[PDB]
């Protein structure tokens, strides 16, 4: 990510 508002958990990565 390069993005705040995301749609689709497939993209989310641990927070870290």
């Amino acid at each position, epitope marked *: 990510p390069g993005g705040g508002q995301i749609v689709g958990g497939v993209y989310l990565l*641990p927070r870290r």
Partner: antibody
Amino acid sequence: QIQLVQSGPELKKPGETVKISCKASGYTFTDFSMHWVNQAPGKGLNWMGWVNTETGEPTYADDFKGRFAFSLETSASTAYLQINSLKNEDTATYFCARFLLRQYFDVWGAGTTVTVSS
Amino acid sequence: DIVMSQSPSSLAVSAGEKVTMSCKSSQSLLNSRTRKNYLAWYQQKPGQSPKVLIYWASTRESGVPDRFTGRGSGTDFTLTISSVQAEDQAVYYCKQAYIPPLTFGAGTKLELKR
């Protein structure tokens, strides 16, 4: 408190255009993606797509690519949904919902129902 | 598109009983890195807009009674209501948000027997 206020019910003739608003309040409008969900009379929920509230970039589900358009007015913390070339089959109630990073809908508007008829 | 299948289509139970709802996806909601299933359950009563109950497949939304419990992982998920009351009469939907477009199940109508 956190709310999504939608415009009233609309009665449009086939082939016309309708534009409904979803005014957010109680939170910073530009921090959460605003999505739209429709429901035909007694038929269940269907995701139409969303509009990024900070970039203003809309994203449509295939089934709504064409006559449907998502827009904003950040200054007014309001989201819009416009349907052009209205079909009788567009009759339904449209909801706007706030989406979270945890991937679910936090708050919803009461929904706006639009009737296509002559 | 990820397909969500919900069943029964509807259920009727007596107050205080435990009811189990099923939802199965086309694919796997489970993100490898986050270790999350992006499956949520929503409750909708007549004329009202939906109201979320569960998100990551299990995590009860704040304000929702522990009576509701979401389980499952992968393609098999369930929603359970341990002590069913009249205020539970509604349609329940599961929604996947793993891979767009977000898709909903057909819903499961829950009524009471008396």
